[PDB]
């Protein structure tokens, strides 16, 4: 099948070009809603944690598959293993409110506590990457720009605080994604990079 | 009916075959390039998600 | 002379495993093969049935 290259139009060639046969497809496992619906571990901090979806590591399954979208939307579920009592606080609230009990507080019950939180940001959609920073003093500019190219601060789902936090896992519901981005695999050094499959 | 995506070989024992690109002939085309891309097909399918931290 | 390696249902791992039991559902079977009993040495091989 010949065509013009520069035109940038999609073109697909089936196996019927040389006498073959085209079979049936089932693509349930690649849907965005399905694949992104599972728990992912996060390294927690002792007292105060800010629930932000960019804290999942970029190498895990959810982390990278999330990072191949420019804009997204989802609700949230968390599963926390703590001591004491756990208090949640909505987006954009003072940090003194982490001590008040009238805010949703879950009393300790072993082993863990699973919650469901809504989406409380003021924007219509969130973003994984943001072009706001518009980009002797050798180290000065290094550590100035390195901290001057993060995301805005209103891209979060709230905060939680407890006497001590030991585990913390995220789960996304009703995920939607816009405007795809690159996604790369581990670059082999030899002719192939092989996992050692289950075999004795 | 299905085939594996895993097993970085760095070894012997090919399983699924090879593909070979040849140059039959050419007229006054020394140094000119041929770029090549890849994409999925009509009936490509992918199953059984896993997490190996890559 | 073992079987191929893709004849399995997956794998499990834990800090320590103490017991493990299998249960099959919706079993289907094809092409029967031999099945043999314990060969007696005497005229009969007898289990000691429930009796005092």
């Amino acid at each position, epitope marked *: 099948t010949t065509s013009t290259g520069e035109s940038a139009d999609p073109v697909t060639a089936t196996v019927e070009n040389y006498g073959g046969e085209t079979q049936v497809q089932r693509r349930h496992h690649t849907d965005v809603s399905f694949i992104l619906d599972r728990f992912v571990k996060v390294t927690p901090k002792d007292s105060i944690n800010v629930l932000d979806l960019m804290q999942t590591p970029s190498h895990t399954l959810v982390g990278a598959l999330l990072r191949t979208a420019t804009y997204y939307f989802a609700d949230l579920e968390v599963a926390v293993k703590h001591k004491g009592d756990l208090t949640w606080v909505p987006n954009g609230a003072p940090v003194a409110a982490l001590d008040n009990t009238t805010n949703p507080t879950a009393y300790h019950k072993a082993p863990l506590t699973r919650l469901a939180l809504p989406y409380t940001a003021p924007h219509r959609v969130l973003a994984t990457v943001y072009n706001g920073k518009c980009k002797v003093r050798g180290d000065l500019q290094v550590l100035a720009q390195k901290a001057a190219r993060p995301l805005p601060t209103s891209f979060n789902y709230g905060a939680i605080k407890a006497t001590r936090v030991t585990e913390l896992l995220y789960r996304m519901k009703r995920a939607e994604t816009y405007c795809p981005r690159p996604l790369l695999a581990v670059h082999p050094s030899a002719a192939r990079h092989k996992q050692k499959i*289950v075999a004795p | 009916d299905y085939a594996y995506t895993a097993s970085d070989a760095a*070894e012997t024992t090919n399983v699924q075959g090879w593909v070979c690109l040849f140059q039959i002939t050419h007229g006054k085309a020394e140094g000119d390039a041929l770029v090549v891309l890849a994409s999925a097909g009509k009936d490509f399918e992918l199953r059984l998600p896993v997490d190996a931290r890559q | 002379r073992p079987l191929p390696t893709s004849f399995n249902y997956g794998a499990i791992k834990a800090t320590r495993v103490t017991e493990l039991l299998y249960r099959m559902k919706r079993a289907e079977t094809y092409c029967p093969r031999p099945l043999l009993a314990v060969h007696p040495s005497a005229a009969r091989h007898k289990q000691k049935i429930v009796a005092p």
Partner: nanobody
Amino acid sequence: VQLQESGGGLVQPGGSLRLSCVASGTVFSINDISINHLGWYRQAPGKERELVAAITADGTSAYEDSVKGRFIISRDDAKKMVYLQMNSLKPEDTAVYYCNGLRASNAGWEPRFGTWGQGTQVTVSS
């Protein structure tokens, strides 16, 4: 992907050696396992490198009947290392030993299954 060894060099005949296999880690792929069959090869000057021994997945061990009964091999999978014991030292030990894996074909074990090794040499001459 490439196995290192240690414990060699220049040594006098009549000592006691335990060659050690400092593996790269054996990143080896999918759960299709229990084909873990390592081995040891020796190599002669200008003469084709010959086998010495081979270890099966759990417990079987064979050796070349030249060295049969004299050497002892065993693997420790809990930490994923394998070693080679060297007792009853003869002049025949002058060869470079390669810690590698086996193929276990119908006729005989085939070689790597790898890129290549570096090796450690034990040449003894009195």
